Amino acid sequence: IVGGYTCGANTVPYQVSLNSGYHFCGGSLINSQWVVSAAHCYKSGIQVRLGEDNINVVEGNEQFISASKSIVHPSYNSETYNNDIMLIKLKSAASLNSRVASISLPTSCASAGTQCLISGWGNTKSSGTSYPDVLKCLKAPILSDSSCKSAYPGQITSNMFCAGYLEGGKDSCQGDSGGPVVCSGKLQGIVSWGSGCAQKNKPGVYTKVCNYVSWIKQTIASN
Numbered sequence: 001i002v003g004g005y006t007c008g009a010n011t012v013p014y015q016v017s018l019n020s021g022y023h024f025c026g027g028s029l030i031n032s033q034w035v036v037s038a039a040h041c042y043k044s045g046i047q048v049r050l051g052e053d054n055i056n057v058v059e060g061n062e063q064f065i066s067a068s069k070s071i072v073h074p075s076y077n078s079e080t081y082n083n084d085i086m087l088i089k090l091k092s093a094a095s096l097n098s099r100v101a102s103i104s105l106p107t108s109c110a111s112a113g114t115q116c117l118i119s120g121w122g123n124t125k126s127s128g129t130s131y132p133d134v135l136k137c138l139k140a141p142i143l144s145d146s147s148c149k150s151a152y153p154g155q156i157t158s159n160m161f162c163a164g165y166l167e168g169g170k171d172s173c174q175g176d177s178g179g180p181v182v183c184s185g186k187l188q189g190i191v192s193w194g195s196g197c198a199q200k201n202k203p204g205v206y207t208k209v210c211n212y213v214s215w216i217k218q219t220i221a222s223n
């Protein structure tokens with residue numbers, strides 16, 4: 001997260017870290033057994049880490065649970081990141097508490113200008129590299145589809161939206177991928193892609209979760 005702030009420990013209790021010996025992507029807990037992330041974060045051997053603030057220090061509210069299965073969206077395209085969403089099942093149910101909590105799925109899509117909260121353990125610099133160990137947060141509005149498509153001609157599908165600030169300075173970044181975009185209490189986006197981080201006229205691009213609620217619900221009920 002570039003241009004954000006320190007969230008405060010466990011104030012985003014649905015935020016998970018995906019760990020394969022090290023943090024490599026964010027995710028969102030959507031019930032006691034399932035996490036939503038980006039398909040481009042797929043790998044084997046995932047451990048889900050819940051209740052995290054400092055991902056390098058055991059602070060006493062963590063739950064580390066291995067994934068028992070992963071399901072990449074059937075139509076995920078790795079070249080374009082169209083349909084950049086995946087579900088991960090926990091081998092055992094998480095113990096839900098005030099620091100480890102699910103986020104609701106949308107009942108409808110969010111409209112432009114709606115404010116959201118984006119969070120993650122990604123790079124905090126727009127040039128060069130610095131990784132925080134505590135969770136970072138950013139408030140950012142959904143941008144109009146026109147501004148989105150203009151910044152990225154021929155690349156935005158109906159499954160993508162942009163959020164952020166055209167002037168630059170504030171964005172998600174590498175290592176934030178898979179993490180949540182929450183607008184009015186609902187998981188409306190997933191950190192997906194962009195151009196650099198926090199560059200002018202290049203806002204972040206996010207998986208449009210509302211389009212996937214039927215697939216999510218049907219997939220978790222059958223697995």
Ligand SMILES: N=C(N)c1ccc(O[C@H]2CO[C@H]3[C@@H]2OC[C@H]3Oc2cccc(C(=N)N)c2)cc1
Pocket residue numbers: 079080081082155156171172173174175176177191192193194195196197198203204205
């Ligand atoms: N539809 C396209 N033509 C497209 C889609 C994804 C794509 O993935 C690339 C570009 O962005 C991804 C990846 O390589 C770098 C990584 O950057 C990210 C990741 C996550 C967040 C951000 C951000 N600044 N908000 C940037 C490239 C082209």
Ligand SMILES: [Ca+2]
Pocket residue numbers: 052053054055056057058059062
């Ligand atoms: Ca920790």
